[PDB]
């Protein structure tokens, strides 16, 4: 289906984050991010915060156990030299707060992928304050065209997978611990 919908968590994968891509057109720098619920509590679109770059979308509002979400973000347009670096927050139903970093470099030939998810304590706006906890002081994962898996705390943990590229793809899955 399409950026800003919420879906069946089985539809999510590989192909459906590569159709979100396509849609996007041929920018130099984009991303696909999907992220399936699999955690036991619904979450709550909170807010996303962009270092570089923008998506025309809003943020799928209401997740459910069993769904999933399918986001997208872009460089900006026009003749600067930026990728796309953003924090997306969810509000869980215990009152926590599940962030997930993503980082698309304009230069290659120096900067690689990168992502990260964790869960915060309470509720957390997506900020620069919490990119850069991601970023420089939370481990984060390379988008190396490899699965990751990682326990977050709070009786979840989660597994993600980001490929290489400047056409981007972050697949996500927070499952119970």
């Keep these: 289906d399409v950026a800003g919908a919420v879906i069946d ?3 999510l994968g590989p192909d459906v984050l590569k ?16 992220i399936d619920n699999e955690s036991g509590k ?9 270092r ?29 030299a930026t990728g796309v670096v953003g924090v997306i927050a969810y509000s869980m139903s215990d009152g926590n707060t599940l962030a997930v970093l993503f980082s698309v470099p304009y230069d290659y030939n120096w900067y690689s992928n990168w992502w990260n ?17 991601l970023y420089y002081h939370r481990s984060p994962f390379r988008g190396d065209n490899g699965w990751h898996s990682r326990g977050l705390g709070y009786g979840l943990k989660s597994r993600g997978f980001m490929n290489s590229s400047g056409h981007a793809i972050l697949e996500i899955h927070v499952t119970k611990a």
Excluded: C
């Design 9 to 11: 968590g089985a539809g």
């Design 19 to 34: 159709t979100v891509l396509e849609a996007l057109g041929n920018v130099k720098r984009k991303i696909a991010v999907g």
């Design 42 to 50: 619904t979450w709550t679109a909170m807010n996303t915060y962009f």
């Design 52 to 80: 570089s770059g923008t998506s025309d979308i809003v943020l799928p509002h209401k997740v459910a156990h069993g769904k999933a979400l399918l986001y997208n973000g872009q460089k900006n347009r026009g003749p600067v």
């Design 117 to 133: 998810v964790r869960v915060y304590k309470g509720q957390k706006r997506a900020d620069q304050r919490m990119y850069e906890e």
